[PDB]
Nucleic acid binder design. Structure first.
Ligand SMILES: [Zn+2]
Length: 84
RNA sequence: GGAAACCUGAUCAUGUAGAUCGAAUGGACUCUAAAUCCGUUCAGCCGGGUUAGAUUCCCGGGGUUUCCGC
């Protein structure tokens, strides 16, 4: 709740993209105001460590459109995302 | 010094999962090419409020533009 994006990812261990797709985070590291994230499916992204970004809002949702196939998100992980 | 408008890839929009463009990446296709297409990924400048719920509304900071100032 109004927390930086690194806190939300570090808590859930998951990510939700602009399309509502859930990915499992394999690695993430902070540097200055930036975050470098590697998903289990292989994607690499670099985002701002903001309290107001779309990913920060999306992690604060209790909805999702689909899960990443290659990330193999478990029903347990999905449940832990739905029940923050 | 003060006032108003806007906000960081671009343009626009916006209290109830923003959109279009652009870029990165994989694939299809192709001649291991071009063109074309598809999948995946990328946002709210910062800090507090209000709210069931905030990029959106309020206050403050910062930046830009414009206007009014000894
Ligand atoms: Zn994934």
């Amino acid at each position: 709740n109004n927390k930086p994006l690194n806190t939300l990812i570090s808590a859930t261990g998951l990510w939700m993209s602009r399309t509502g797709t859930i990915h499992k985070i394999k690695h993430h590291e902070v540097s200055r105001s930036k975050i470098y994230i590697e998903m289990a499916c292989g994607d690499h992204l670099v985002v701002n460590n903001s309290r107001s970004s779309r990913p920060a809002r999306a992690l604060r949702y209790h909805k999702y459109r689909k899960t990443c196939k290659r990330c193999r998100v478990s029903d347990e992980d999905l449940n832990k995302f739905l029940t923050k």
